[PDB]
Structure 1
Amino acid sequence: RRLVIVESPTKARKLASYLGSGYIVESSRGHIRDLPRAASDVPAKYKSQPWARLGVNVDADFEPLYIISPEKRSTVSELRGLLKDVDELYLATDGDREGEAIAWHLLETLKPRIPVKRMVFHEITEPAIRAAAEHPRDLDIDLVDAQETRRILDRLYGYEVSPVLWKKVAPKLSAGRVQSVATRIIVARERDRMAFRSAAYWDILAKLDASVSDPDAAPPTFSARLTAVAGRRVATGRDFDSLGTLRKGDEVIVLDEGSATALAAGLDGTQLTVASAEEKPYARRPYPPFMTSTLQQEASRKLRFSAERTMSIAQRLYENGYITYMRTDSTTLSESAINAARTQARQLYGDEYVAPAPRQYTRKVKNAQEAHEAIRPAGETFATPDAVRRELDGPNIDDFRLYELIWQRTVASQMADARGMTLSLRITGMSGHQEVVFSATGRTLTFPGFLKAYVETVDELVGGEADDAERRLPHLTPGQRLDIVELTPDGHATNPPARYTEASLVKALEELGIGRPSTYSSIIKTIQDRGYVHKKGSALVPSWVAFAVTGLLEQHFGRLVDYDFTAAMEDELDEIAAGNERRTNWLNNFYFGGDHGVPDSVARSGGLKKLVGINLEGIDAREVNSIKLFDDTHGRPIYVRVGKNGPYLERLVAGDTGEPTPQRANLSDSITPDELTLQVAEELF
């Protein structure tokens, strides 16, 4: 008989049902080996090596020490029994570098003498599994070296950086490179909010009627806003910087309440005149099929799922044969999937809404072996979301919602474009002796197209307009008169930059090239668990400890938390996965120093060991645990310190001949860092 090893029991039962008899299917429950987690994990043979606890022999080309987990040994025993009376072996783990490394570890652990076959697949269906089992491929050692390079890199990073965090910030603080970079993103946005200063600006909102000079203009009444006063443009929210002063761009005029009421008063009684009216046709192409990044984003905005929950649901959907592999950076659809989406599309929305030619959204992927297709429904024919809503009855009651999202996205990717018109409106009038201009913008939707099947949701904090929202304006002619219904002077203020959500954080991690489909949700979940970041509604808010660690790394180990260097490291790991870079050369280069890599990187600056040593002794600590905020109304610098009791406020005041003497207050997590202003600081003292 034949043996087949997978990672989870569900995958094992499904593959067992599809392969039939003559195949035995067992799971390995994930990884069977790992680096030593304690001194007791080191076998007696390696206890003579002083590097065994670290598990990496940096002086022997980073030779790792792989030990079988104490709870996993029994599993291996079972796998060592089944291999006795079978005549063939099949490693059916996931096709990414994780699953390839699991396969490699299984080979090193079991050491089979019968032929070995690695079968890969990105959907669990009977045709795809039977096809994969009949056409195997060789074990990609480059993927194994990429995953292994990541593991060793993380072990060395923790080994070199964790003690710094224990001595300078707080013990029991777990280190983490990419986590500290994403934490730096969030801390940077919070700092931007703290330094922000609002600025006031005023305009005039007008309600205009056109049913007198055009007794059939729909809509009859529309809105317009003041844009110019006697040739000078009226300031808006975009004309100020983060400190509240006008930008060094075009010349504008800032209005207040008295000026706006004066202009509206001098405008009442008269009429306005249409100066310009321009309609431009536009077409909107459908959204690409889902990948991990876009799936987590849209699942967060529309379904309020966290990235972790999205990936859990998507894992259960994938292993049960409902969706394709959820860890992909590809938006490609095979011909059968395209034909399925076009069939369901024509069946549900009609022939005019189908794209007249099959649409392909092929983009550059990081590795052609790890990602084949997009996240889409599985099979030659897509299971209807109602049938899936029938089968998934019980504890998992959102899986049908995620599945329906994927289905609507996939079907909508093969539908027709969305036609419409965009409208520009320039109006003029006379307030006293000053000419005034009233602008109005419009946008219609003549044909919805794919928008009848899928519409992306706007980010909650960023705000904006959806792709199917209409701002309809009547058809007007240059020189047409308009009647004024109301003149309301309007006041506004510049708003601070928006906080990140999980969706906008995932988008940032992808744009900066810092995250991969395998790491988004783990980055978010990890930075939330370790206490660096918490949630206010849907906003990510950094704690003060996150300020302390981010400040330390920024001030003394800047290369570790630089965005471009981190993205470069991810690109080099990917280059190892493709066989263009070698694990040994990269690890020597990064740890001990070399001549390869982007300028001024850790590898080009002496390596990780020497840089952590040099930068560690190059500090005097002192204010590492102090986050400077501002000064008070007497000139005393106020800052926040993180101690055993948590975050507390501190300043320095004189103290009767024995001056100075510090003053401390206590603050909980109720006050976000941007709310802790000078007034709030004085109230808490």
Structure 2
Amino acid sequence: GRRLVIVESPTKARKLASYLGSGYIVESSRGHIRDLPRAASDVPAKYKSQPWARLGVNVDADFEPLYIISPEKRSTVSELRGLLKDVDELYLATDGDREGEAIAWHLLETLKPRIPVKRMVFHEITEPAIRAAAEHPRDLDIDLVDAQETRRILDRLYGYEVSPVLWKKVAPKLSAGRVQSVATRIIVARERDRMAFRSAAYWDILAKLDASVSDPDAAPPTFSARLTAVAGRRVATGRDFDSLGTLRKGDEVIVLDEGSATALAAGLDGTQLTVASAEEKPYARRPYPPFMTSTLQQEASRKLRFSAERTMSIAQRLYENGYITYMRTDSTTLSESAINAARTQARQLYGDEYVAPAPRQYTRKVKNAQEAHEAIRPAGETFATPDAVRRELDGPNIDDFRLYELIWQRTVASQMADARGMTLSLRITGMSGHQEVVFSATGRTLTFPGFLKAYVETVDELVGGEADDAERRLPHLTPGQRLDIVELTPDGHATNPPARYTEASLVKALEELGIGRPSTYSSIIKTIQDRGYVHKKGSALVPSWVAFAVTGLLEQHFGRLVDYDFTAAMEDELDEIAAGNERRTNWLNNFYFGGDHGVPDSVARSGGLKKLVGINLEGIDAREVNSIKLFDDTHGRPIYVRVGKNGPYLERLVAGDTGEPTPQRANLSDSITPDELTLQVAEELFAT
């Protein structure tokens, strides 16, 4: 009575074997065992008579794939076949999402069992979860397998059609990547917005006011306020200017400068201000939901400074070793046992007052419940505390401890009571010579921390802002109360260009645009950095010059392929295949050959990928593709970056010795970010 069990990895195999016990042999497939051909030599002799076999897809026979065993996986397949000959049953215990379902399907196609097969699905590796899964197998879900295969074939066809354009028009060393190119466009577009941004100056007055002379119990006795109106005209702030430094077409404002702000402050010397309005308004802040993949990568990035790749590598270990639930999920739902476990831990650490009065369920509907239906949380019916786990995960496993702690803290905080406090507003009037001025101040208290004692989100380092537990205190004041002026400071400001993305804020955008999925956020972000499209300047993602070249080529000549809405619709359509609401063959025929289905003017409705890419490329001039226009110099001569074989350089045409146009050049490193290469910097590079 021997049973063979197959999982993706050796760590998972040892952990399952520890719970299944005697009579189970648990082996690892090392991931996928088959793939489309990667080179001519992968094509077996039987298929060398098929001209499509190297591409690996017969588009004329409903996109029939040629799956072959990768040469580095032959010995794995050979061992599994030999083991199979000596067992009475086969258990396939890969992940239950479409990736793991496709691996199970491939193992069946390759191993061809003559014995019963049980497909085991679980989202945490605990003795009760593994025992349950073995006793209650799931039927193989061919809709999941078809969705996985649709994406595999899509990626192969996309690469087959688009790569040669990139090679001919940009550089031979480039690889096509469809969703990668969209993420790169997001980053390029932001850099272009920063390059085109022009700042505007505006001034106000910062006042330090002292209320201790009027009300001796004022706490705090001093506070800050800013000038917000003059003679019934609102003072301009940074939000009132457009991206070129001109006022928006909204309500009238007055833009102060140094002179007018200083003159206003001067007319306020020796006078008192008067409280006009003072409001105290309660707020109640609900806890953050339990983690899903997107918010785990965002918070691990902002708080722990982990890259999304590092976070998912750590989470994989924590999952395979039994510490957390499955880490690729769009659910924030907790099981009844995990709600009760979190609520008990909160009570024991923070007291009855800090537990939510009723249990909190964050039942956000998941697009496919078959693939992952629980939040990322500590595994088991009772969560191991961090203190309990700190010893097991010390030394070289410190990353695992730190991410486990973050997950534990988030999960307990999700079952805690709302935070409470007061939002504070203050409107203050005075007179500067003949002109009435208004001063404004705001404030926020935290009278009850609630869940914030256990978890506070970290603000994005580039966007900035106030943390959810920060407090800004203001004394209690009454309309008509007099205030003395301690200090008056005319204060100068400039508008700021839109923030670059961090890894955290790019994940957030990929999720909100509907372009990323739990299984793809981190691989997109890692791949755009490894293939040289994007690099890191501190925590900021900065596009390289070749990213401008490739993004421009796609935008100018293949625009539907990098359109955010068309991309999100394709990702949604693949999900419909996974749910059994759309057919693999129908989808591939419509996308590749053209069809009457999908959103208006998509690749499919315009005639299909094959026709879209196969336009006349002679009109695409490689020289302009690899030329990024920056600006004219003071003589009106265009300056541009050229992406050469040896990397980028600055260029402009100038009068030679004969007076005819002559190239002047200056080589460029990624030390200079694109929005830093101003005209002034360019002239400096041209001098050397």
Asked whether the two chains share a fold, i.e. TM above 0.5, the reply is yes
Q: Secondary structure at the match of 1:496?
A: coil
Quote the Cα distance in structure 2 between the aligned partners of 1:465 and 1:188: 27
Quote the Cα distance in structure 1 between the aligned partners of 2:367 and 2:310: 25
**Alpha-carbon contact 2:169-2:621 (below 8 Å) kept:** no
Note the C-alpha offset of 1:364: 2.0
Note the C-alpha offset of 1:235: 0.4
Q: Deviations over 1:129-188 (max 9, x none)?
A: 001100111000000000100000000001000111111111110110000000000000
**Alpha-carbon contact 2:169-2:620 (below 8 Å) kept:** no
Note the C-alpha offset of 1:549: 0.4
Q: Deviations over 1:320-349 (max 9, x none)?
A: 100000000000101100000011000000
Note the C-alpha offset of 1:3: 1.2
Note the C-alpha offset of 1:617: 4.6
Note the C-alpha offset of 1:620: 3.8
**Alpha-carbon contact 2:366-2:373 (below 8 Å) kept:** no
Q: Secondary structure at the match of 1:462?
A: coil
**Alpha-carbon contact 1:593-1:602 (below 8 Å) kept:** yes
Note the C-alpha offset of 1:622: 3.8
Q: Single out whichever of 608-617 and 90-99 deviates more from structure 2.
A: 608-617
Quote the Cα distance in structure 2 between the aligned partners of 1:195 and 1:71: 50
Q: Deviations over 1:221-250 (max 9, x none)?
A: 000000000000100000001101111101
Quote the Cα distance in structure 1 between the aligned partners of 2:655 and 2:356: 76
Note the C-alpha offset of 1:213: 1.2
Quote the Cα distance in structure 2 between the aligned partners of 1:170 and 1:187: 18
Q: Deviations over 1:49-88 (max 9, x none)?
A: 1111111111110010000011111111111111112111
Residues 112 and 421 of structure 1: CA distance in aligned 2, closer, same or farther (over 3 Å): same
Note the C-alpha offset of 1:667: 1.5
Quote the Cα distance in structure 1 between the aligned partners of 2:667 and 2:12: 52
Quote the Cα distance in structure 2 between the aligned partners of 1:620 and 1:193: 27
Quote the Cα distance in structure 1 between the aligned partners of 2:398 and 2:347: 29
Q: Deviations over 1:539-561 (max 9, x none)?
A: 00111000100011111110000
Q: Secondary structure at the match of 2:622?
A: coil
Quote the Cα distance in structure 1 between the aligned partners of 2:170 and 2:34: 33
Quote the Cα distance in structure 2 between the aligned partners of 1:22 and 1:237: 70
Note the C-alpha offset of 1:619: 2.8
**Alpha-carbon contact 1:179-1:526 (below 8 Å) kept:** yes
Quote the Cα distance in structure 1 between the aligned partners of 2:648 and 2:29: 44
Quote the Cα distance in structure 2 between the aligned partners of 1:18 and 1:579: 34
**Alpha-carbon contact 1:198-1:243 (below 8 Å) kept:** yes
Quote the Cα distance in structure 1 between the aligned partners of 2:21 and 2:661: 81
Note the C-alpha offset of 1:657: 4.8
Note the C-alpha offset of 1:634: 1.1
Note the C-alpha offset of 1:211: 0.9
Quote the Cα distance in structure 1 between the aligned partners of 2:601 and 2:616: 15
**Alpha-carbon contact 1:557-1:615 (below 8 Å) kept:** no
**Alpha-carbon contact 1:556-1:615 (below 8 Å) kept:** no
Q: Deviations over 1:415-459 (max 9, x none)?
A: 000111101100000000000000000110111100000000000
Q: Secondary structure at the match of 2:247?
A: coil
Q: Single out whichever of 62-71 and 651-660 deviates more from structure 2.
A: 651-660
Q: Secondary structure at the match of 1:352?
A: helix
Q: Deviations over 1:614-661 (max 9, x none)?
A: 263553444111111111111111111101121011112233556222
Note the C-alpha offset of 1:393: 3.1
**Alpha-carbon contact 2:37-2:67 (below 8 Å) kept:** yes
Q: Deviations over 1:294-315 (max 9, x none)?
A: 0000000000000000001100
Q: Secondary structure at the match of 1:428?
A: strand
**Alpha-carbon contact 2:162-2:176 (below 8 Å) kept:** yes
Quote the Cα distance in structure 2 between the aligned partners of 1:71 and 1:439: 69
Quote the Cα distance in structure 2 between the aligned partners of 1:646 and 1:3: 53
Q: Secondary structure at the match of 2:483?
A: strand
Who is 1:197 aligned against?
198
Quote the Cα distance in structure 1 between the aligned partners of 2:183 and 2:645: 25
Q: Deviations over 1:245-295 (max 9, x none)?
A: 111101001111111111101000010000000111100000000000000
Residues 397 and 606 of structure 1: CA distance in aligned 2, closer, same or farther (over 3 Å): same
**Alpha-carbon contact 2:627-2:643 (below 8 Å) kept:** yes
Q: Secondary structure at the match of 1:585?
A: helix
Q: Deviations over 1:473-522 (max 9, x none)?
A: 00000000001000111011101111000000000000000000000110
Note the C-alpha offset of 1:469: 0.2
**Alpha-carbon contact 1:285-1:418 (below 8 Å) kept:** yes
Quote the Cα distance in structure 2 between the aligned partners of 1:590 and 1:382: 47
Quote the Cα distance in structure 1 between the aligned partners of 2:671 and 2:89: 61
Quote the Cα distance in structure 2 between the aligned partners of 1:326 and 1:348: 26
**Alpha-carbon contact 2:168-2:622 (below 8 Å) kept:** no
Q: Secondary structure at the match of 2:160?
A: helix
**Alpha-carbon contact 1:652-1:663 (below 8 Å) kept:** yes
Q: Secondary structure at the match of 1:223?
A: strand
Q: TM-score, normalised by structure 1?
A: 0.99
Quote the Cα distance in structure 2 between the aligned partners of 1:520 and 1:68: 28
Quote the Cα distance in structure 2 between the aligned partners of 1:411 and 1:622: 58
Note the C-alpha offset of 1:371: 1.0
**Alpha-carbon contact 2:394-2:401 (below 8 Å) kept:** no
Who is 2:36 aligned against?
35
Q: TM-score, normalised by structure 2?
A: 0.99
Query: What pairs up with 1:212-361 in 2 under 5 angstroms?
Result: 212-361=213-362
Quote the Cα distance in structure 2 between the aligned partners of 1:645 and 1:325: 44
Note the C-alpha offset of 1:22: 1.5
Quote the Cα distance in structure 2 between the aligned partners of 1:203 and 1:322: 54
Structure 2: gaps spanning 5 or more residues: none
Note the C-alpha offset of 1:461: 0.5
Note the C-alpha offset of 1:392: 1.5
Q: Single out whichever of 657-666 and 252-261 deviates more from structure 2.
A: 657-666
Q: Single out whichever of 314-323 and 650-659 deviates more from structure 2.
A: 650-659
Who is 1:454 aligned against?
455
Query: What pairs up with 1:178-577 in 2 under 5 angstroms?
Result: 178-577=179-578
Q: Single out whichever of 519-528 and 611-620 deviates more from structure 2.
A: 611-620
Quote the Cα distance in structure 1 between the aligned partners of 2:40 and 2:673: 42
Quote the Cα distance in structure 2 between the aligned partners of 1:248 and 1:63: 57
**Alpha-carbon contact 2:500-2:541 (below 8 Å) kept:** yes
Quote the Cα distance in structure 2 between the aligned partners of 1:593 and 1:553: 20
Residues 338 and 615 of structure 1: CA distance in aligned 2, closer, same or farther (over 3 Å): farther
- Indicate yes or no: 2:614 matched with 1:619: no
Q: Deviations over 1:177-227 (max 9, x none)?
A: 000000000000100110011110000000001111110010000000000
**Alpha-carbon contact 1:97-1:146 (below 8 Å) kept:** yes
**Alpha-carbon contact 1:301-1:457 (below 8 Å) kept:** yes
Who is 1:582 aligned against?
583
**Alpha-carbon contact 2:330-2:366 (below 8 Å) kept:** yes
